[PDB]
Design a protein around this nucleic acid. Structure first.
Ligand SMILES: Nc1ncnc2c1ncn2[C@@H]1O[C@H](COP(=O)(O)OP(=O)(O)O)[C@@H](O)[C@H]1O
Ligand SMILES: [Mg+2]
Ligand SMILES: [Mg+2]
Ligand SMILES: [Mg+2]
Lengths: 48, 313, 309, 312, 312, 312, 312, 50
DNA sequence: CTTCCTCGAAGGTTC
DNA sequence: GAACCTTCGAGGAAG
């Protein structure tokens, strides 16, 4: 899952979020097994 | 009605209203979203209200945001995920969006997907996010500063116009039903003619006439009271304030129509340069009473026949 | 005190004073807040004074701040959070607020709610009914969207000799000076139509009456006191009288340019145009022309010369 | 996509199209890169589309960027290093990039190498870096706005121009096929006459006439229907838009043809002066509807008769 | 010392000096602060000197600063809040203060309070600061550069005029006792009449003649020494410099008195158009040697009888 | 490479070369730098090339920049600190360098010292620098547009004229010899006559005709091929550019030959005033197509007999 | 070196030298600093040179800066904080200082103190800085730009004149010795008559003739080598350039001596309107070749004999 | 010695000291020249795309 | 975003 | 009607 976490967190940073806040945002998500697409979708949806 | 739900309930704007009716009906005849629409016009005419009516006619939900409230790409991308299939996104003041976000909107508009490039060199990759079809509705008071690539994405253009006496009169009549006061049709016409064609200005005069009609009268706005109310206030039968009349009289009586400079005119009426050039002068130009020349302002023949002075070439 | 407290004490401004009485009485009858008011016009006419009268006539507690002091959105939000129902917020020199703040204020004036991102965070607040009062000398400097939200406009005008004469009599009793009816009119004529200038002359005359007199103002003391200050019976100062004299005796009434006239009186070009000429043009002693400026027939009669076209 | 991919498919621009063929094939005979090319002309004529055709005819991988996308020298230096021999680099709005970047570009185009000076005072060095052979293709809206010393580096000048009715009628029919639109050869000419020479406009009008034909008609675009639809879109028979008609009507009715200053005109019609002089005046001047004088703008006789007003 | 300290030692300015005597004495009988005074007029006439005299006569301490030093509202809010009851604040060159700062003085001068935002973030609040009674004094050469709401608040206005031959003669004798030199009364008048009515110019000529009298003479100034020194400096009996004479001569010997334009005359003397109009022309007009007309400059009869020609 | 390396390779400009030979040779007996030299004249005549020849004759390094590229006074100081003794600094378009920067050259050229502020805040201090001996070579189009203080410090001035047919003909023959090509003497003369008297244009055209003759022809250039190839381009039968045609074709139709001010003409043809007056007007005047008048420029009879109009 | 260092070596300017010698000698006897002095006049006459001579005669270290180097009040305060008793501060091109900084000198130049703001911002107060005795030396090409309150504070004014042939001849001889080139007195007078009375121009011509006299002369500037060299530079025997000669010829050949207007003549010579009036006309009028009149300008008899035509 | 040169070159090109350090520090090759290092630090940091 | 200053037009006199 | 001189007004660019 570290591959998706690093990829999804990195893509979230590419959207302009700070590395610290971006790491927390995805770290705040529960499901680890879901792919990067789900993490970014759930992360931004929850952060709305 | 003041709060409309369909194009049947929207007062005025008959030209733009007639076009959109044909486009919406055609889009409904196919499983397609309406093309991206751009609305142009001066401020205060109703661009926000029209965007809502477009959504109800489409039978779709409406999302609202603004250019200034968007500061990073993540802000816009997060909002797009909230759009259901066919949803409408309304962005006010779209001309102020920073280029860092503008470059991201092109693919969402053109292809309905976003690419998020990540990595570098041998690690270069990109994630792909599918988006449901949506209609972007933009509104801007300034078109000359939109980039050509953004302009090419919008396919439907609409131009707003100032309201006309036969319909601005209905706005007054309707507003008089929100308050609980009777107003005669002849009195309503005399207020509409002085409202400079803007609904916001017509509401202000109605409130002021209301206050007079219930302290100096029987609580009814008839033609007899409207004349007295409009006599206390300076507003003439053309919408000209007291200071507006003083400017034209000064130019005609003391300078023979000009040319006269901004500084020389200001010291005669006892006002600042910026006050005459930005408050009073803009309406006098639109009405056609003055011109600006390399040598100063000059009064036109239309002004002479309105103030009631004899004119000579 | 020098500042009137109620409309029953506010002399003049019959146009603005009459209009506000109708709007204040109607608002009370409906128990609603007064609409937003903008006061503008020349200096010294009564803009700041009227702002306090409106609060007393409404019977409300006045909150007071200024434009220059508000420098960021965080400042305005803090002030707005202190308002209670019916409170009045008065902002003097409103033309100095930053553009980043005007956009926040014209939203609050429309919908009575704020939602702004002030380490950044969003804050949302709801506001009770309140009235904003603004005063400015440079109304044309306010953004066009903000001017559209004000529902009442008050433009101030100069005063007449009967209004200023009564003001001088009122002020004289606060200083506990004695003044005659005909001596007051001699100060009103010289006050250029402005209350602040009329109050200034009374203070300068009182100083002379106490040292060079018995501490009482009369038709004889005023003659001497006004000769020392060198103020003509039309309010012309020493430099004002010198300008008209030079024009009539060295250029035959003009036309003459601003530069030539300045060098001949030993004054700076910007002092004549910005400090002395504005009153001479409004009274009709001088006219501006495409080729220069010329003295009118009114100046010849005042200075005592035989007019020749 | 709608755009063509080879010269044998690109409609119009016969002059530009014929010149590039000779230079492209001649360069192949010599087995060397093509000279730097500058494309200029009004917006929407096909400048970007041509850039892809050149790369396909040469048989090279196209690389793209734009003037605003380059912000520091490292950006340009990086892109130039990622090039492969013979690559074609296309740069939109080559006149818009910051002046500090141009200093580096001048070396590359002329010498094919860059030399980064480093050190100060007692220290002073420079590193000499070779670049692969390449070709720069730039596109701008005006030729005179570009920095004069840069213009001398472009060997080939390609001036684009408005299409004629035969070309526009073919483009309109071609597009109608993609959309599966039934259009008669006469109606296609009606839209071409009113598209004022720009393919981008002709395509946009067609998309709007389709909707009208599907409701106000039987899905068949006849000349009789196309003419009614264009009056609904508020497009004049000469192609003057709503804004263009508003300008001429105001000059004739409120100022008797002028002269009138730009400030007065731009305040009467609620439009920004920056827009009037940039987006609308150029077509009215080229088509001879308006003339500019030191005293202001003036309406010509042609305009007086077109709008339908008796000339003085 | 070189600056007077009491109205006894302040020669001239009878109008301004007489008015300030009454206002100061009346303020003392009521035991209250003096009203706000604005001093303005030409350079070198005694503006800064009078500011220190008023402070001594009132018997209070003087706080001094200048316009160019005050750059932001934080500075003014720091100078204020350090005042004690009855202090005098003197700001020189007050016309330089930014207008964004002048608007802070409106409340302080009229009502002795200011509105201060205190704290930061959620702690930001507005509170009144209350000032003790005080007198603001300002000196400026460009009174017309101040804002109308500010000039309206100054309660006393003092305009400085030029001196005359009796007053300047006494000033020269007084200064001749600060330095240790004997000066004949006849020589003192000869230097006064050449000092254009300005005390600063009279002191400068005395310093220059002192040097000559102690190097080329016996250390005493007499009609013989004074006339020799004034010949080296080349200043005539009317105060005309070397170039002032060259201008008048050229007008009378080449143009017969004029009219002549400024440009045509500048080239004949190898001066430049801005030096002649700003340095030399002002005193020639103020003293009646030249007259300005729509057609050009003209020399008056007074100039002919000075250069010795015939007024034909 | 194409660019000449030594005076024996530089063709034409005999008047300038003859002078520079003497001064350069004299500057070699004594061990000193060459005086600051100013080159001016129309664009494209070969003045940047001359800078390289002087540097190679002196045996020193040449650094290059341009006026518009220098943004602030700190930029020029950074450059001057990086020059070796005897180096040559070439500044193009020196008349457009901002005033804040030009002010620094006055001291550097005359005395080889510069005064500048170093550090910040409490560390700010003034340092006096020493510049190693160096030569400044300036280039400008407008000999009279430089300020009086700058023009007085240049010790040498050179005016560069248009080339004659014998000179241009040999330059075409030389350029067609660097490239592998064969051109007949009659073709060289025709191509030179068509080249606006400017070396840059002659090279650009020859480089293009090389392609046509290699594809559409026999691999050799002859008058028959030159006349055809020059007709596929826009070059007129007497060298007028397509922009030149718009100018003449406008004045004769929109203004009846004139007179017309070049300001209003530029905005009606959609060309920048500066480009048309610097590049195109000088040639049209020196060849009799346009004549100057106080009211503006006027089209001569020579234009009517060229464009095919009637000289009514 | 080229610049003289003592009043014995400084040729000319006797009126300025005579005054400065008396004032410097008097200042030393009292053991006090010299009064502030202002040097002004046309370019190249020796102002900057004199500023250094004064420092050598007073026998003190000279601090140096320039008008365009000072950008903000912080810089000026820092410079003044480094002063030592009796130091001389030279500010060249003083007219370039910004007004807000020039007004800081008003106190420093006569009260020797400055008002500064200090502290972190929580606590901040005005304080008087106190300066040691110093002498400010200013030099400017145009004094009309200095504000009236500043010019009044300078105690010694020096106005530079042009040089005469006797004095200018000695400057050429002195310079020939430094170059170790022999020059005949007959030739030194031939260069002086062409130098327009300016030392800078006489040095420039001598350097150019020195080169020619040794590359193809025989190492001696004889009466004939000078004529051959000066003919190559195209300098007439009155110092007229080709442009100056063209003007006089045109007026005589095409207008019979005039009167002719400025706009009419400019067109006949293809010269820019302001160039003729600012660059060329001033020297022609001063020497008497041209005369301005109410109906135009006329060429005098002097201009006839110089060209060889028959005056009538 | 090439480290100081490469880092100084990247600074001259406008890279901040933080990134210039990381860029050059990420690459390592004792036999590489300052020229081949610059041609590596940039090629390693640009995002190649297709 | 603001103060300054310079480019430009036109009224009036004289031969 | 060509040439000079003065005065006003709106830009624009360097802070
Ligand atoms: N006399 C000459 N002989 C050979 N080539 C020349 C000559 N003069 C100019 N050129 C060539 O023409 C071009 C001139 O460009 P350049 O010297 O930069 O002109 P500018 O300096 O006016 O821009 C160069 O390509 C140069 O090689
Ligand atoms: Mg107030
Ligand atoms: Mg002072
Ligand atoms: Mg110097």
């Amino acid at each position: 899952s570290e591959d998706a976490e690093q990829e999804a967190v990195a893509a979230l940073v590419a959207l302009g979020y700070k590395p610290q806040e971006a790491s927390r945002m995805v770290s705040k998500i529960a499901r680890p097994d879901a792919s990067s697409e789900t993490l970014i979708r759930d992360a931004l949806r929850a952060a709305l | 009605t003041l709060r409309p739900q369909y194009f049947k309930e929207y007062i005025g704007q008959d030209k733009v209203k007639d076009q959109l009716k044909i486009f919406i009906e055609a889009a409904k005849l196919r499983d397609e979203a309406l093309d991206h629409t751009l609305l142009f016009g001066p401020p205060g005419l109703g661009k926000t209200t029209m965007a809502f009516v477009i959504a109800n006619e489409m039978g779709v939900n409406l999302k609202q945001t603004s250019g200034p409230a968007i500061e990073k790409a993540g802000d816009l991308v997060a909002i797009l995920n909230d759009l259901e299939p066919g949803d409408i996104l309304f962005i006010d003041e779209i001309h102020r969006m920073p280029m860092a976000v503008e470059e991201v909107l092109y693919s969402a508009m053109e292809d309905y997907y976003i690419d998020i490039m990540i990595g570098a060199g041998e690690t270069s990759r990109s994630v792909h996010l599918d988006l449901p079809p949506f209609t972007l509705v933009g509104a801007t008071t300034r078109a000359g500063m939109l980039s050509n690539p953004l302009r090419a994405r919008f396919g439907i253009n609409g131009h707003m116009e100032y309201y006309e006496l036969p319909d601005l009169t209905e706005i007054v009549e309707r507003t008089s039903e929100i308050f609980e006061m009777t107003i005669t049709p002849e009195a309503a016409l005399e207020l509409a003619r002085r409202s400079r064609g803007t609904p916001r200005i017509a509401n202000r005069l109605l409130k002021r006439v209301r206050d007079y009609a219930q302290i100096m009268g029987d609580g009814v706005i008839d033609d007899k009271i409207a004349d007295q109310a409009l006599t206390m206030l300076d507003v003439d039968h053309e919408g000209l304030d007291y200071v507006d009349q003083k400017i034209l009289r000064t130019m005609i009586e003391m300078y023979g129509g000009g040319p006269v400079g901004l500084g020389t005119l200001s010291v005669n009426i006892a006002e600042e340069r910026e006050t005459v050039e930005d408050m009073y002068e803009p309406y006098l130009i639109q009405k056609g009473f003055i011109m600006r020349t390399r040598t100063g302002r000059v009064a036109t023949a239309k002004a002479y026949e309105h103030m009631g002075y004899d004119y000579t070439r």
